[PDB]
Design a protein around this ligand. Structure first.
Ligand SMILES: NC(=O)C1=CN([C@@H]2O[C@H](COP(=O)(O)OP(=O)(O)OC[C@H]3O[C@@H](n4cnc5c(N)ncnc54)[C@H](OP(=O)(O)O)[C@@H]3O)[C@@H](O)[C@H]2O)C=CC1
Ligand SMILES: CCCCCCCCCCCC(=O)SCCNC(=O)CCNC(=O)[C@H](O)C(C)(C)COP(=O)(O)O
Ligand code: SF4
Ligand code: SF4
Ligand code: SF4
Ligand SMILES: [Zn+2]
Lengths: 165, 62, 112, 157, 385, 332, 65, 27, 51, 185
């Protein structure tokens, strides 16, 4: 080929002129602000639609919203919900047993979008790792405690997606 | 007050006075955040219970 | 190599059964070394085991069913030749092994 | 007990501090939870900050994160890998598939929970668990390690 | 020759990879991949679920490209139902499929470069991967397994700031790609470890069932978004990159170009997205609004019937394929007229690509086998269902 | 004594047998098999442990979910024992130690703990079956201090509860035994296997799985076992020489025996005896040169010709020549 | 916690800080835990959880009312 | 409602998608 | 031992759509209760195949 | 090029004794042939100038327990030159060996192995026909309609045996089948 082109490409071969261009790129990122977060102190951004730990809600009067319609147990693609119901002393349709297998749960939100009374919701909590398998077998009391503990945030989120759901 | 079951808590709310013979219960101030609309006939002497909320409605005058 | 074409009569099925039995018998030395079966089983007890399987599957008169049985047996033999299956598995399948039966079952459970 | 109640406690606290500050997990990535583990170790969360660095071999790792669907064909290998790690070892189950089978619980070729093959110390729920959920699981494991009293129990026996 | 085993259990290479290699010297003569370690019986589990209940299984098939499988399943159900999708929903599906394509390509390129020994681009690409998965977390409630694309329309609408944030991302993704290329494209080591490794002729690619980048690297201009267009892909302008040598380096240049073109398509979708409803108006097949189910009787009946029984697909069978990031992803759906699919085969491009590893690696160095495995961009969620 | 079992399944892992047992000392050798065979029938097992929480970790795999519940306890404290014994229709005692710790002597670890466990079961009426596991050579005249303590625990348990069966096995062989494994470890470390008695004493090795199955069968009896003392022994009457020959056969090494008369081995094991006291309470436990074991290996230990055995429970012990000793291939 | 504004205090004593971001963000919403004993990694109430994770723009004092 | 997510009036600003050249070095 | 039968029309509905199909009943009744959560346990593979 | 053209061309050019069922629709142009003419048909459709079908997309089986020929084997084909798809179907029972097409399409090997693993259909002249997806020593073909969803055997670790063992299946919570079928369908 041309002598000039041959000499120019031969210099790049022997002077490593395409590795210095990568070393400079790495060094530029060396002197640059980091993108890591202090997880214990600061958390990553989320959305009001986040599907986290399940919670059973209750009416502001103190009555649980669940009406034992079993419409969430039939839509659950993982069969993670088991519900037992009977007629309460007042004659109202309520659940005696409402337990969710969080080792079967796929956190898809189908139960939340199938509930006609907004009783079962997936709250914003995602930090509930346990040391025992049986602590992941949530029951009605555990779910109601979750709903009571996360009530304000769940209500605010449900207000947020009222415009969309 | 965790000792009170939801039955005892819903049994303490006084019935709502309604002037007409029928009342519509939605379950919340915002309709979209409650339960499906429920029309309750207030033509008895005992308070009439919503089958979703458990709230009781009673006729005011007659 | 390739799966043989489906047989047309019982004589061909018998020939394939004998060929498979001979291949399995020649495969006995390899298993005794791949798995530590030297001080475990005699080199003839296994042979008797394959013979017993062939004999208790010997009431079949459909050549297609016989060919499918031979193919499944060959697949099992090839799997055993490789280190695919665990050691106790073959020792759990390939080892040769008083009032009333009804009364014992009754004492056991209601579901016979 | 004039010094044992103090010196033994200090020597044990040193051991706990070392073991919590130097955790080398062996990531057993099998499924979509492997993507979440790789995101956790990325620059956004920097799992190397807390001393956690992943290791390829089981002879150099003191923790094992099972994150993915455990099938019947893979369990013999999972147990073999578990048996090769040194004695002070812990297992972290990540995701629904590793916890109890998950979305494939009723399958014919799925082990219904990695706790039927190896003893699990921490269960991280999710499908897939968030990267901060895995961070919380590792912090729970660290809190569990600080509860160990190895030298005191050895003294008391 | 001896019989050597690579089982990498560590996800420094896939994670469930099991190769039994027959090496003569340092060359490998036959590569037999042992699959079945991630076979979870997905195909049989589909037959026991409702058409709505079987949607989340497709998120976990190719867990690097989630929306791609949902799009194919939704299109198959629409084809068997003759359900028309509104234009806004189609634009949203195309937008989140081209976001998915960028996600898959970004993961594939850097998990392949990390196998070679380049650690820096991996974190840089996962930063943009996190930025993109934030959008996944916004429309749905899941970062990865988002059941967003659904057979009728789409699950739910876009938040207010999503378009602005996606535009802000697209203003800098070009420079991110430029940095990622500049770290690898010009490097002589990267060229020496990819050039002439994995050469496949077009005839071999056609015979072995190759699709996507594996097929287009051999000179075959075959894109399913231009040959059998779906949604609004025929209203968008984008080029189809085609290779010339068929080696691993062409698969990489094309995997760069397909992501630049994906950025282009994303920009066009953002600019041309119309207003309207996001689901089909046949509420016999789509859920009613939460305000309409609590106020109208027939809407509540539709909600109750849909969330227990679901819809019933008329008895028929069809094969629908889309251009997944890996290649051609197809679903063979058979319906008997009930609310549950009778049969649903999942045609995974990885199944046809890991099968051809035997002829691609023959007479290659042992260290050149990991590059051949990484250039096919295989995930075992789809390889063995 | 019927009422301690109610089958509610197919006899599998998820089945339900009406047995809720508290197995003390289940973190040792025999416990690992007894708990496994108890869990297979669907019986809930409570495993009280002491010290590190990693000791009962391997037992969680045996049950389905909640069938095995480890609970911390302290032998010195009495309310902990009552707490870990409340929900239990069956109590099995496996607590024992063959060497001496300055915290727990031979009498404390073998007799006093058994006494406390029997008494607590006495006040906490409701345990239908109680099993205490002594050693085959247990006798008041035995020179070995451990065996005498086990015998005294035998009379203590029988007096405190006449319905308590006393399964009394012999030297156990298994994956984690303390006779075959130390021998192989010594051989791989020094090349020769010492014989503290010249390979003369006769004893009856038994497979640990056979002993666990015997305890299980005694639990699932027709009521004959109550207040009996079985003597669980192996089929063949081996000796210290013939067992070492089998061990060499499995480990695949050329035999090399160093005969040692009783006095020299007794004096070589003596140093640890009078050095139990020191700045540290812990001290390296003996492996093959336990003075107590050397004294125990002076009188031949065989199953009594006029005592209950394996065949009185409809069980046949494994022949300790094939499968029982297959674990020795790890040193091969 | 330098050049930062304290948004509010919590019933457990946790302090919440905020810093203004321009184009790239970073350290703009975090907590200074009042405890030091491993801090349990989860001590944020539901009124402050949403503000920390950017779910809602309400501080949490305003979420109570 | 009638306020729905979409592009602002006039569309979004144009964005580069091709490779930007880098002529750095004396050679 | 199985039973081949054609399921009949339910008494609570007048529709006759789920008729004309034949099923094999395996008589799978061996079920019990999980003593941890009250779930229905089984050991029969043919518990729901015929249905 | 199109379903209207491919149907009419294959009607005329193809030998009549091969195909016995030709559906022409928008869901897909199908050809149903006997199992002893499958290889001939697929070789004709791979070499003819106007029907250059050079890509075998996949091979799937469908289980129909109510039919005499229980299994339906479907060959989805693609023609890159003419941008068209063709589907060819055959029918086989549990003890018939259909011809293998690995000679024509090298990619057919793994799909035929998967069909044999999942349904039990054997292929003549297949270089190696062994299970590809199920566990080693798996007994039964899971994708059959009579195969239980959870299978027959279950896997757990046996501590005394010191290995992972296989045991008969025993579910803690059985699969709950919900019958949503409507009588007014
Ligand atoms: N060859 C054999 O093994 C023979 C065994 N036996 C008897 O069988 C029984 C068990 O067999 P094996 O399993 O071998 O016994 P191990 O010594 O192997 O296991 C001992 C068990 O007892 C517990 N233990 C020991 N000392 C104490 C104590 N002072 N306080 C509380 N718990 C204690 C241990 O808990 P930790 O580990 O936490 O101390 C462990 O769980 C023993 O009584 C033994 O004498 C009979 C004949 C021979
Ligand atoms: C370790 C090795 C692994 C593999 C071991 C083998 C595992 C599979 C065992 C084989 C399984 C089968 O059933 S495969 C073989 C099954 N096929 C038949 O039994 C054919 C019917 N039998 C007859 O025709 C006659 O009885 C005949 C017996 C031939 C002789 O009798 P005659 O000639 O007088 O007629
Ligand atoms: S989130 Fe999905 S899998 Fe979990 S309980 Fe609800 S419906 Fe079932
Ligand atoms: S949580 Fe909702 S859907 Fe589920 S049973 Fe209760 S009311 Fe019905
Ligand atoms: S838990 Fe969910 S994300 Fe994790 S491996 Fe299982 S299906 Fe995949
Ligand atoms: Zn109401």
């Amino acid at each position: 080929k041309d002598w000039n082109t041959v000499f120019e490409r031969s210099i790049n071969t022997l002077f490593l002129t395409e590795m210095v261009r990568g070393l400079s790129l790495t060094l530029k990122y060396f002197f640059d602000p980091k993108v890591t977060i202090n997880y214990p102190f600061e958390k990553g951004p989320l959305s009001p639609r986040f599907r986290g730990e399940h919670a059973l809600r209750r009416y502001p009067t103190g009555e649980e919203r669940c009406i034992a319609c079993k419409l969430c147990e039939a839509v659950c693609p993982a069969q993670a919900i088991t519900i037992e119901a009977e007629e309460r002393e007042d004659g109202s349709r309520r659940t005696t047993r409402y337990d969710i297998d969080m080792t079967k749960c796929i956190y898809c939100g189908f139960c939340q979008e199938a509930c006609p009374v907004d009783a079962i919701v997936e709250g914003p909590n995602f930090e509930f790792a346990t040391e025992t398998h049986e602590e992941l077998l949530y029951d009605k009391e555990k779910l109601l405690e979750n709903g009571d503990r996360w009530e304000t945030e769940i209500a605010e989120n449900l207000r947020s997606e009222s415009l969309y759901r | 007050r965790s000792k009170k079951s939801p039955m005892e808590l819903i049994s303490e709310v006084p019935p709502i006075k309604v002037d007409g013979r029928i009342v519509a219960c939605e379950g919340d101030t915002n309709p979209a955040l409650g339960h499906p609309i429920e029309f309750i006939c207030l033509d008895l002497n005992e308070p009439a219970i919503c089958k979703y909320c458990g709230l009781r409605y009673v006729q005011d005058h007659h | 190599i390739g799966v043989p074409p489906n047989s047309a009569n019982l004589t061909e099925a018998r020939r394939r059964v004998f060929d498979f039995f001979r291949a399995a018998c020649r495969s006995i030395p390899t298993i005794m070394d791949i798995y530590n079966l030297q001080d475990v089983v005699a080199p003839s007890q296994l042979r008797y085991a394959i013979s017993a399987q062939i004999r208790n599957n010997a009431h079949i008169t459909d050549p297609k069913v016989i060919d499918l049985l031979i193919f499944k047996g060959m697949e099992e033999l090839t799997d055993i030749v490789d280190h695919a299956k665990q050691r106790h598995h073959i020792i759990g399948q390939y080892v040769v092994g008083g009032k009333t039966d009804f009364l014992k079952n009754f004492y056991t459970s209601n579901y016979f | 007990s004039k010094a044992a109640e103090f010196v033994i406690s200090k020597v044990d606290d040193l051991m706990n501090w070392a073991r919590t500050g130097s955790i080398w997990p062996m990531t057993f990535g099998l499924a979509c939870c492997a993507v979440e583990m790789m995101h956790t170790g990325a620059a956004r969360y920097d799992l190397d900050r807390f001393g956690i660095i992943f290791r390829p071999s089981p002879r150099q790792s003191d923790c094992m994160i099972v994150a993915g669907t455990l099938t019947n064909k893979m369990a013999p290998a999972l147990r073999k890998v578990y048996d090769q790690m040194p004695e002070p070892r812990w297992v972290i189950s990540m995701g629904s598939c590793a916890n109890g089978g998950g979305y494939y619980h009723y399958s014919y070729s799925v082990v219904r929970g990695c706790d039927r093959i190896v003893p699990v110390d921490i269960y991280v729920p999710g499908c897939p668990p968030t990267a901060e959920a895995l961070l919380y699981g590792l912090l729970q494991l660290q809190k569990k390690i600080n509860r160990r009293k190895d030298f005191l129990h050895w003294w008391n026996k | 020759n001896f019989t050597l085993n690579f089982g990498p259990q560590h996800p420094a290479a896939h994670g469930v990879l099991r190769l039994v290699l027959e090496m003569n010297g340092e060359v490998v003569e036959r590569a037999e991949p042992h699959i079945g370690l991630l076979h979870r019986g997905t195909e049989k589990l589909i037959e026991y679920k409702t058409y709505l209940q079987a949607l989340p299984y497709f998120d976990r098939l190719d867990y690097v490209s989630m929306m791609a499988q949902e799009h194919a399943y939704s299109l198959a159900v629409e084809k068997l139902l003759n359900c028309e999708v509104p234009l806004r929903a189609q634009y949203i599906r195309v937008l989140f499929c081209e976001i998915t394509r960028i996600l898959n390509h970004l993961l594939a390129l850097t998990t392949h470069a990390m196998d070679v020994g380049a650690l820096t681009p991996f974190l840089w690409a996962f930063e943009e991967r996190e930025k993109l998965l934030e959008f996944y977390e916004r429309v749905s409630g899941a970062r990865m397994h988002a059941s967003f694309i659904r057979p009728g329309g789409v699950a739910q609408d876009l938040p207010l700031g999503l378009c602005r944030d996606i535009d802000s991302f697209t203003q800098q993704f070009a420079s991110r790609i430029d940095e990622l290329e500049e770290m690898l494209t010009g490097n002589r080591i990267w060229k020496q470890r990819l050039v002439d490794i994995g050469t496949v002729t077009a005839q071999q690619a056609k015979d072995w069932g190759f699709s996507g980048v594996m097929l287009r690297g051999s000179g075959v201009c075959w894109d399913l978004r231009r040959a059998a267009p779906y949604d609004v892909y025929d209203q968008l302008d984008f080029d189809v990159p085609v290779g010339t040598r068929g080696d691993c380096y062409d698969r990489y240049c094309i995997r760069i170009e397909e992501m630049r073109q994906s950025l282009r398509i994303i920009v066009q979708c953002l600019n041309q997205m119309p207003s309207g409803m996001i689901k089909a108006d046949d509420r016999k097949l789509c859920p009613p609004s939460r305000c309409r189910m609590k106020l109208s009787m027939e809407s509540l009946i539709h909600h109750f019937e849909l969330y227990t029984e679901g819809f019933s697909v008329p008895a028929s069978s069809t094969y629908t394929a889309v251009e997944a990031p890996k290649g051609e992803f197809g679903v063979f759906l058979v319906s008997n007229g009930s609310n549950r699919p009778y049969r649903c085969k999942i045609r995974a491009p990885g199944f046809a690509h890991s099968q051809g590893l035997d002829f691609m690696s023959k007479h290659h160095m042992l260290a050149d086998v990991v590059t051949i495995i990484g250039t096919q961009d295989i995930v075992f969620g789809e390889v063995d269902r | 004594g019927v009422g301690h079992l109610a089958r509610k399944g197919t006899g599998g892992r998820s089945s339900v047998s009406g047995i809720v047992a508290t197995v003390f000392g289940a973190t040792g050798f025999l416990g690992r098999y007894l708990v496994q065979q108890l869990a297979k029938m669907g019986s809930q097992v409570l495993v009280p442990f002491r010290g590190s929480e990693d000791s009962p970790r391997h037992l969680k795999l045996m049950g389905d979910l909640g069938q095995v519940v480890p609970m911390k306890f302290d032998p010195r404290d009495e309310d902990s024992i009552k707490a870990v014994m409340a929900k239990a229709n069956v109590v099995i005692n496996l607590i024992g130690r063959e060497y001496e710790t300055r915290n727990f002597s031979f009498e404390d670890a073998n007799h006093h703990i058994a006494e406390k466990l029997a008494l607590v079961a006495k006040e906490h009426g409701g345990i239908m079956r109680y099993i205490q596991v002594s050693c085959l050579g247990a006798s008041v005249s035995s020179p070995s201090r451990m065996l005498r303590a086990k015998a005294a625990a035998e009379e203590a348990v029988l007096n405190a509860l006449p319905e308590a069966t006393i399964m009394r096995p012999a030297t156990m062989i298994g994956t984690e035994d303390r006779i075959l494994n130390p021998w192989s470890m010594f051989v791989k470390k020094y090349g020769f296997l010492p014989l503290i008695g010249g390979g003369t004493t006769k004893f009856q090795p038994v497979y640990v799985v056979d002993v666990a199955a015997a305890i299980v069968a005694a639990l699932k009896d027709d009521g004959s076992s109550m207040g009996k003392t079985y003597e669980l022994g192996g089929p063949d009457v081996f000796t210290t020489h013939e067992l070492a020959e089998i061990m060499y056969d499995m480990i695949r090494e050329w035999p090399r025996y160093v005969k040692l008369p009783f006095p020299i081995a007794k004096a070589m094991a003596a140093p640890r005896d009078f050095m139990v006291n020191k700045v540290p309470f812990p001290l390296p436990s003996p492996q093959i040169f336990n003075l107590d074991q050397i004294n125990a290996l002076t009188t031949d230990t065989l199953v009594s010709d006029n005592a209950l055995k394996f065949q009185d429970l409809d069980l046949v012990p494994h022949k300790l020549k094939g499968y029982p000793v297959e674990f020795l291939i790890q040193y091969r | 916690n330098i050049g930062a504004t304290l948004v509010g205090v919590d019933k457990f004593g946790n302090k919440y800080y905020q810093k203004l971001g321009d184009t790239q963000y970073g350290r703009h919403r975090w907590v200074e835990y009042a405890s030091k004993d491993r801090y349990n990694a989860s001590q944020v109430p539901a009124e402050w959880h949403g503000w920390l994770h950017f779910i809602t723009d309400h501080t949490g004092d305003e979420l109570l009312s | 409602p009638l306020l729905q997510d979409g592009p602002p009036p006039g569309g979004f600003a144009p964005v580069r998608y091709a490779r930007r050249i880098s002529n750095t070095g004396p050679s | 031992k199985v039973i081949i039968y054609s399921p009949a029309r339910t008494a609570t509905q007048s529709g006759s759509g789920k008729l004309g199909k034949w099923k094999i009943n395996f008589v799978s009744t061996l079920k019990w209760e999980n003593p941890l959560m009250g779930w229905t346990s089984t050991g029969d593979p043919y518990a729901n195949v015929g249905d | 090029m199109d379903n209207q053209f491919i149907f009419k061309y294959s009607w005329e050019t193809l030998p009549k004794k091969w195909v016995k069922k030709m559906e022409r629709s928008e869901h897909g142009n199908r050809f149903d042939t006997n199992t002893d003419y499958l290889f001939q048909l697929l070789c004709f459709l791979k070499l003819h100038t106007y029907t250059r079908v050079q890509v075998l997309i996949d091979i799937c089986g469908v289980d129909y327990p109510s039919r005499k020929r229980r299994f339906e084997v479907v060959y989805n084909l693609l023609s890159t030159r003419y941008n068209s798809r063709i589907r060819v179907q055959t029918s086989a029972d549990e003890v018939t060996r259909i011809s293998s097409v690995v000679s024509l399409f090298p990619s057919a090997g793994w799909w035929e192995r998967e069909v044999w693993d999942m349904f039990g259909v054997s292929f003549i002249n297949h270089p190696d026909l062994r299970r590809i997806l199920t566990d080693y020593g798996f007994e039964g073909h899971p994708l059959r309609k009579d195969f239980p969803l959870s299978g027959y055997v279950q896997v757990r670790y046996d501590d005394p045996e010191k290995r992972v063992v296989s045991e008969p299946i025993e579910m803690t919570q059985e699969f709950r089948y919900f019958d949503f079928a409507s009588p007014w369908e």
